[PDB]
């Protein structure tokens, strides 16, 4: 059976000698927004409908968590100003559970501040993440704590690998875990060196594009990954796009065109390097269209 027919443990089927950068990994953009039910607000703030555990079951391994410091010991998951009805502990417990049940998968967790801290907060978002999550004895062993800048699948599986969008950090393991952090350019395709120059990060995050220009930006980066066998290069390609302006000009609406379109392209390419592709409505299927998550999964080679 091709890898996508068992999306719950597809990483277990790969060679764990690979660097995670070389693996083609599906991600979910604003992973935690499956909690939104308000139909007006969901048009622009809702980007998923499957919970964390279902996303993981359908094969998602890169989770995009953006949050807000809501107390000196607490981070809330958010889409900008919109609170997604749970705290970061919730994603961490679900991940731990999942990783316990499927011990040969790794999760990459992107952490970003999306909104101003509660007025009672006296500490930085980075400091609260570092002290009350990363170093919290409660989540002991959950995170990747190695000193490898380019970790392999063997040394991370069973664990969450931090992908640091918080700015400079005193955290020392995972991508961008140094006091420079990741220099992220707004609404752009860009490249920046991370981890004391060990890695070359290549990002297409043109989140305000109209869909047609989005496809073209997604494809351009896709075609760069294809012919790049450098393991020190890491590709992050966001399919997802901001809402257009009316009702039913929704992120869903665009994803329903972008996903099948990109999924088609990856499939026609066979087993080429794709990078990490971060999507809205991961695991949402339309009768008669290629599935983006499945196609990312199957683009990985098996030797
Ligand atoms: Cl809501």
For residue 27, the domain's CATH number is 3.20.20.190
Rounded-to-integer distance, Cα 188 and Cα 69, Å? 26
Whether 152 and 23 have beta carbons less than 8 Å apart is answered as no
Instruction: Output the CA 195–ligand 1 centroid distance in Å.
Output: 37
Resolution (A): 2.1
Instruction: Output the CA 118–ligand 1 centroid distance in Å.
Output: 19
Q: Which two tokens stand for residue 245?
A: 């302006």
**Contacts (Cβ under 8 Å, ≥6 apart) of 247:** 40, 43
**Cα 42 from chain centroid?**
20
For residue 146, what are the domain limits? 1-303
**235: exposed, middle or buried (Cβ count in 10 Å: 0-12, 13-18, 19+):** buried
Whether 14 and 156 have beta carbons less than 8 Å apart is answered as no
Rounded-to-integer distance, Cα 183 and Cα 175, Å? 12
DSSP the chain: --GGGSGGGGGGGS-TTSBGGGS-EEEETTGGGGG---HHHHHHH----S-HHHHHHTT--EEEEEEEEEETTEEEEEETTEEEEEEHHHHHHHHHHHHHHSTT--EEEEEEE-SPPPTT--S-HHHHHIIIIIT-GGGTTTB-----SS-BHHHHTTSEEEEEESSS-S--SSBT-STT---PPTTEEEEEEETTTTEEEEEEE-TT--HHHHHHHHHHHHHHHHT---TTEEEEEE------SSTT--HHHHHHHHHHHHHHHHHHT-S----EEEESSTT---TTS--HHHHHHHHS---
Q: Which two tokens stand for residue 75?
A: 């981070």
Q: What b/e sequence results for 250-277 when a residue is b if at least 16 CB atoms lie within 10 Å of its CB, and e otherwise?
A: bbbbbbbbbbbbbbebbeebeebbbbbb
Rounded-to-integer distance, Cα 44 and Cα 235, Å? 26
Instruction: Output the CA 177–ligand 1 centroid distance in Å.
Output: 33
Instruction: Output the CA 34–ligand 1 centroid distance in Å.
Output: 9
- Tell which residue, 133, 222, 124, has the closest CA to residue 181: 124
Instruction: Output the CA 250–ligand 1 centroid distance in Å.
Output: 15
Q: Which two tokens stand for residue 10?
A: 């597809």
**Contacts (Cβ under 8 Å, ≥6 apart) of 97:** 53
Q: Strand 74-79 vs strand 62-71: parallel, antiparallel, or unpaired?
A: antiparallel
Q: Which two tokens stand for residue 89?
A: 């502990």
Q: Strand 199-205 vs strand 188-194: parallel, antiparallel, or unpaired?
A: antiparallel
Instruction: Output the CA 50–ligand 1 centroid distance in Å.
Output: 15
Q: Strand 82-87 vs strand 188-194: parallel, antiparallel, or unpaired?
A: unpaired
Q: Which two tokens stand for residue 19?
A: 């660097």
**Cα 279 from chain centroid?**
8
Q: What b/e sequence results for 173-203 when a residue is b if at least 16 CB atoms lie within 10 Å of its CB, and e otherwise?
A: bbbbbbebbbeeeeeebeeeebbeeebbbbb
Whether 250 and 49 have beta carbons less than 8 Å apart is answered as no
**Cα 77 from chain centroid?**
14
- Tell which residue, 50, 49, 83, 52, has the closest CA to residue 69: 83
When divided into structural domains, the chain yields a total of: 1
- Tell which residue, 167, 68, 61, 159, has the closest CA to residue 114: 68
- Tell which residue, 159, 217, 165, has the closest CA to residue 187: 217
C-alpha triplet 177, 206, 167: angle, nearest 5°:
20
Rounded-to-integer distance, Cα 118 and Cα 112, Å? 16
Catalytic amino acids? 29, 79
Q: What b/e sequence results for 32-54 when a residue is b if at least 16 CB atoms lie within 10 Å of its CB, and e otherwise?
A: bbbbbeeeeebbbbbbbbbebee
Rounded-to-integer distance, Cα 84 and Cα 64, Å? 13
**Contacts (Cβ under 8 Å, ≥6 apart) of 227:** none
Instruction: Output the CA 38–ligand 1 centroid distance in Å.
Output: 4
The length of the chain, given as a count of residues: 303
**Contacts (Cβ under 8 Å, ≥6 apart) of 95:** 52, 56, 63, 107, 109, 142, 160
Rounded-to-integer distance, Cα 303 and Cα 300, Å? 10
Rounded-to-integer distance, Cα 232 and Cα 230, Å? 5
**Contacts (Cβ under 8 Å, ≥6 apart) of 36:** 42, 45, 46, 79, 82, 84
Instruction: Output the CA 68–ligand 1 centroid distance in Å.
Output: 16
Whether 199 and 231 have beta carbons less than 8 Å apart is answered as no
Rounded-to-integer distance, Cα 228 and Cα 296, Å? 16
Rounded-to-integer distance, Cα 164 and Cα 176, Å? 5
Q: Which two tokens stand for residue 81?
A: 């100003």
Residue numbers followed by a gap, the chain, C–N over 2.5 Å: none
- Tell which residue, 207, 216, 220, 218, has the closest CA to residue 292: 218
């Amino acid at each position: 059976d091709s890898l996508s027919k068992s999306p719950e443990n597809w990483m277990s089927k790969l060679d764990d000698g690979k660097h995670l950068t070389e693996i083609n990994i599906p991600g979910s953009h604003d992973s935690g927004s499956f909690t939104l039910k308000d139909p007006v607000k969901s048009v622009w703030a809702k980007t998923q409908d499957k919970d964390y555990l279902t996303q993981m079951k359908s094969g998602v391994r890169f989770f995009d968590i953006r949050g807000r410091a809501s107390a000196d010991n607490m981070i809330s998951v958010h889409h900008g100003m919109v609170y997604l009805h749970h705290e970061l502990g919730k994603f961490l417990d679900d991940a731990k559970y999942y990783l316990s049940a499927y011990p040969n998968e790794t999760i990459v967790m992107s952490m970003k501040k999306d909104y101003d801290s509660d007025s009672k907060v006296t500490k930085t978002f980075e400091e609260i993440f570092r002290e009350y999550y990363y170093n919290n004895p409660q989540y002991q062993n959950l995170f990747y704590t190695g000193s490898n800048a380019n970790p392999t699948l063997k040394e991370t599986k069973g664990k969450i690998v931090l992908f640091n969008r918080m700015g400079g950090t005193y955290i020392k393991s995972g991508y961008g875990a140094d006091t420079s952090g990741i220099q992220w350019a707004d609404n752009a395709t860009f490249e920046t060196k991370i981890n004391n120059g060990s890695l070359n990060l290549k990002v297409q995050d043109e989140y305000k594009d109209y869909y047609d220009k989005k496809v073209e930006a997604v494809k351009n980066l896709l075609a760069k990954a294809k012919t790049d066998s450098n393991k020190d290069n890491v590709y992050v390609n966001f399919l997802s796009v901001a809402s257009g302006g009316s009702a039913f000009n929704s992120t869903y609406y665009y994803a329903s065109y972008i996903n099948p379109e990109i999924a088609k392209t990856i499939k026609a390419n066979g087993k080429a390097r794709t990078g990490w592709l971060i999507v809205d409505y991961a695991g949402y299927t339309w009768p008669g269209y290629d599935d983006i998550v499945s196609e990312i999964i199957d683009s990985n080679k098996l030797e």
